[PDB]
Amino acid sequence: SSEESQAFQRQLTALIGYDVTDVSNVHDDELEFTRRGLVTPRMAEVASRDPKLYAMHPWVTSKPLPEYLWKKIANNCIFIVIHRSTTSQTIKVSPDDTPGAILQSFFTKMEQDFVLRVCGRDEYLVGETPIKNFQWVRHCLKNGEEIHVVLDTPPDPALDEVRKECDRKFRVKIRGIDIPVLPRNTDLTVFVEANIQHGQQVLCQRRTSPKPFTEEVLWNVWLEFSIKIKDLPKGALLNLQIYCQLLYYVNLLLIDHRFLLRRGEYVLHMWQISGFNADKLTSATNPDKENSMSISILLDNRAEMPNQLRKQLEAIIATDPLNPLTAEDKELLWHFRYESLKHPKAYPKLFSSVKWGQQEIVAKTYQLLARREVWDQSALDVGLTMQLLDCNFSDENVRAIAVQKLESLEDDDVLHYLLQLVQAVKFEPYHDSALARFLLKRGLRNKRIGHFLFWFLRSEIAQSRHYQQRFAVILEAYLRGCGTAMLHDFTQQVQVIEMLQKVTLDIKSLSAEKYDVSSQVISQLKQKLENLQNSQLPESFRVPYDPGLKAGALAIEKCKVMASKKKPLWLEFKCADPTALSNETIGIIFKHGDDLRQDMLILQILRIMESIWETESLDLCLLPYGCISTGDKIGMIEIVKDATTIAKIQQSTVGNTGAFKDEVLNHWLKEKSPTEEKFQAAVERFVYSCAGYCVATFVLGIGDRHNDNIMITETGNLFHIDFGHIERVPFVLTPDFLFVMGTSGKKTSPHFQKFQDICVKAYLALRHHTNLLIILFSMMLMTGMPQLTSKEDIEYIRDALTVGKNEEDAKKYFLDQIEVCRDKGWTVQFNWF
């Protein structure tokens, strides 16, 4: 070691938010073994790094340019405006040409150590891509926007340097359980339940004879199982549970990370049930030694197929991910496993038909995984791959085929999936695994990815007792090879966030529940930000949720506390980049109160929902705004510019407890539209946004909202917010919205007609991915909700998506939805109270 080097670890810790050297909540070698394990991949990928494409992270894509999108292009002309200091000549260009082959078209049209960089951002039109395939360039087009770039020097790759570095049956003894205080209530009776467990598949289960719930209860029994030792699958968890009805659980992997059987004495600190979930799968023990329940244990150990079978097989294989398989089905899949292989889509259900508690069958299962000819040939399907990484699959090899498929994902597509792929690490049985390695591999390769990987890992580490150790290791593995420039920037980001959190907390506890912001609130708020500015606060930090943007000093005067029971901050920021061709402000909302892990999740999905709607050339104009969780009920949210709550729009002349009126939105639109053609822009925008957010919310099942949770931009763009949070209605299309569309009371019109077309297009577009959505949604609930049900709750989205039905019974369903809402109008709005 050095000292030094520990000073490194000292900063590494400050970024992680957790001690990876600390060993006080362990009982085996694995975390440190994974630290060491992750060095070879770190260092390979670091070694392969194209150093000049890495400093400049071109955010590009191989997806075609959407049609919509094409019909914003001249005659294969695209206008691009190069700047230099107090200068700027335009240069027309073709969509299908390179930033390598454009600078020279500048140099001509009146030394190659220059690069087209986006104005305002750290973002770069560099590398051998057609400029139409850069994401800013796609951004600018869609958002009727002008493409502005400053010619200057490539940043120094040197800045981005990395520093150098038995046929007996299984049996467990149950000694007893200890707990410092009961006083839950008076008393009851309790028994330990020992389950051996693979993919939330319970293999064998025993339990103790019941006994009286005291502070300490000894047993002191042996619980022998059916299963033999040679048959325990790798990944088998021993799941120890206490009933009275379930209140504590803990898990001990049986086979450890050296393929060695767990043996000997354990005293295991358990978790507590408080009010089918990812937390129950954990290898972690509760780090709180003083309060927790504790358990003590000792371990001392050719052909050709019939016609209608192929139909029953194909029938099963076609079914949804949430279809439960019968015994009958499973045996059918297994018997004809070699047929099953021909269809990649059968895989999930085929490996779900394996009996993993049989070493011989597991054997056969592996044999046919060596027959990956068709799988390795299949075009990548994420939805399918995704389901092999959920809680139903505990076998490394199975999971490993899933991760092989993920390498075809170019970065672009990683981003779309990252949050959930990170959330999939909670379903890994061991700390080191192909999924972790991959997340690291693919984070270290692209700065964009490395950034969001850092804020997704830090978010869980910050607030998940159940996983902070694992992620911490994975995060350190990242930080150790990411580049010292990334590191410096990260350190600031985290600093700014720690201050700004302090300020949003102090002001929470300085504010009761009286819907007023007092002078001495907006004094202490004002003062603190000043008394901070000024102190303390970096000259410049990079914006989580949007790392193109850096932000300088606070626009104190524009900062305010947002009239609400959580008193979130409404901070606004100067932009550190002189070349920013505006003086529009950077608007962060810090907030304590809600679980932002739920927002993130829903936003990810929405982004996926667009990309889907891209494949079919639909732009539904969603606004999935920035949002990063940074701790227990605490994080930030991007401020959509030029935006107002509907509820605020419905207060104008319209008073207070009095509401609402059918028009008022439309006037507000015009009270904001310059011309009359642009106003038509907005009403189209509105028809699209409105359809967008109804189809999505209906599906994710969160449509029924109070209208101060729903906003619009001055240019017509409607969008939900605060998914917080969640006589019922399937989504929010109220009378106001039907005005603007023009149909009062209830007849029809060309914009309500258009609105109907789009919605059906979008919804049915969504149904061309049923499997992907159900898998994301189910994963969503398991890794990010509290009170949840492996049936009814997840079984919602199937119905909502009208699983089973055809394109007509479908369109029927949804247009009824539209109508159910219409009856009906303000009923649920006024029902606020």
Ligand SMILES: CNC(=O)c1nc(-c2cccc(-c3nnn[nH]3)c2)cnc1N
């Ligand atoms: C009045 N709200 C806004 O102007 C606004 N709100 C949001 C937003 C997004 C998500 C949640 C919230 C929120 N509402 N109450 N607390 N937090 C607010 C984003 N951009 C905005 N421009």
